[PDB]
Design a protein around this ligand. Structure first.
Ligand code: HEM
Length: 450
């Protein structure tokens, strides 16, 4: 044994890197997830396979197959994502839930993320849009070059607290440690770090760890928050959901999926507006045309912003946070002539696709015009997929976008961001399992006549 699934991609006739005995193909992750995926797409073509230990992963690319798994799948065959380390009571989280139990939660929370309940949340988010400008004004006046993800991570926190349970606080290094230390600890998992890398190789550990009540969502923070929710559940997203303890699972997840996820994207965007100060100028004017001098953004003032939408999307093109998109093959099935067997993890190289000469010309270039209607809609969904596609895509995509734009509005309409000393140029991506800069983005911020 040690090499269970290795007979697969040979007997099936699918190309790919040849695996070692217990590791299979992991050492290839020495460059990262996206790095490994670019190489594989180039070399093995449109479809190939590799082994995450003894777990076979088939990477598809033909948009025809992509729609069939991301759409023709509601229990059909594909439906769940790869199961990871000891989850504990979080096995009730919607992003972690499976099969019928998932469809329940999904179609139960959907109401909570409708337009109308969003245009209703705007007021609140705007509130923290202004706090951001205040806190950003300090670092401008002091003349010290700013570290992005810190102000954005604070903004993300501010909006997560208030919208998840109306807990209004000024996270941003001000009353920085009330109920903020817990929340602040809910970061994305780096699946390429020692711990997870081991479990991927030795999945038999999961049942072992779970008996020792070791969970991948630290008991410390989950406990705090589970008791908090109960507190205000009595005092009374929380208000809309309001099982009694499945509710605590969702609430924590939204924070997990929206926190470091938003500030991470936002910091990337402010980076592109540095050696694209020209783009920032256009954006700035577009914001002033719609909203007079420092006019307050409205739910609809945002939708009417072609350029803002172009800058955001093109940023998400180059940097699709969830590098990959994968689903698990529930049963044996063929689909568009291919045949994938039960238990195989179907992967979709989001980052690699978003940077492949086939659909993008000079793909390394940050040029917004791609999304202006004329270049726009000449691009295939299933190819550009930052929030995924189909039934099981980002349930909070719009919210994510609103939030990120509102943050751009007030910010752009008050400051100008230009590079400085430690500001890396070009970029350089980390070789870990998270799509981050590697050496955080630093930008000098100056007030716009203030
Ligand atoms: C920069 C912002 C964000 C990006 C790029 C993003 C991206 C994604 C992606 C790519 C997926 C997987 C889609 C798929 O596999 O088809 C996903 C799932 C999910 N996201 Fe987000 N997301 C963002 C923000 C948020 C926010 C703010 C929330 C909070 C409501 C959220 C909640 C979720 C949930 C619950 C799922 C799981 C859905 C399910 O399996 O039913 N996301 N997101």
């Amino acid at each position: 044994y040690g090499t269970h699934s290795h007979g697969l991609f040979k007997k099936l006739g699918i190309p790919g890197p040849t695996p070692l005995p217990f590791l299979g193909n992991i050492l290839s992750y020495h460059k990262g997830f996206c790095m490994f995926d670019m190489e594989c797409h180039k070399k093995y073509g449109k479809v190939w396979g590799f082994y995450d230990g003894q777990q076979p992963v088939l990477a598809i690319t033909d948009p025809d197959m992509i729609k069939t798994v991301l759409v023709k799948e509601c229990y059909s065959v594909f439906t769940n994502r790869r199961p990871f380390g000891p989850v504990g009571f979080m096995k009730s989280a919607i992003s972690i839930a499976e099969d019928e139990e998932w469809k329940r939660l999904r179609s139960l929370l959907s109401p909570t993320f409708t337009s109308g309940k969003l245009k209703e949340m705007v007021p609140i988010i705007a509130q923290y849009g202004d706090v951001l400008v205040r806190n950003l004004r300090r670092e401008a006046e002091t003349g010290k070059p700013v570290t992005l993800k810190d102000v954005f991570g604070a903004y993300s926190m501010d909006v997560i607290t208030s919208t998840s349970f109306g807990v209004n606080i000024d996270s941003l290094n001000n009353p920085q440690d009330p109920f903020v230390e817990n929340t602040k600890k809910l970061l994305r998992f780096d699946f390429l770090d020692p711990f997870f890398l081991s479990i991927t190789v030795f999945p038999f550990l999961i049942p072992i760890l779970e008996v020792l009540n070791i969970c991948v969502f630290p008991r410390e923070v989950t406990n705090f928050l589970r008791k908090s929710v109960k507190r205000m559940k009595e005092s009374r997203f929380l208000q809309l959901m309001i099982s009694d303890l499945e509710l605590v699972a969702q609430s924590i997840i939204f924070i997990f999926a929206g926190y470091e996820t938003t500030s991470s994207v936002l910091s990337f965007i402010m980076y592109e507006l540095a050696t694209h100060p020209d783009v920032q100028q256009k954006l700035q004017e577009e914001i002033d045309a719609v909203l007079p001098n420092k006019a307050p953004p409205t739910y609809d003032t945002v939708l009417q912003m072609e350029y803002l939408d172009m800058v955001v999307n093109e940023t998400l093109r180059l940097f699709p946070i969830a590098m990959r998109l994968e689903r698990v093959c529930k049963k044996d099935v063929e689909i568009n002539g291919m045949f994938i067997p039960k238990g195989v993890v179907v992967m979709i190289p989001s980052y690699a696709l978003h940077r492949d000469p086939k659909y993008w010309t000079e793909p390394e270039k940050f040029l917004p015009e791609r999304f202006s209607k004329k270049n726009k809609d000449n691009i295939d969904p299933y190819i550009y997929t930052p929030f995924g596609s189909g039934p099981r895509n980002c349930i909070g995509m719009r919210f994510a976008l609103m939030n990120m734009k509102l943050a751009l509005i007030r910010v752009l309409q008050n400051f100008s961001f230009k590079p400085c000393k430690e500001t890396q140029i070009p970029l350089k991506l980390s070789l870990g399992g998270l799509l981050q800069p590697e050496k955080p983005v630093v930008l000098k911020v100056e007030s716009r006549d203030g």
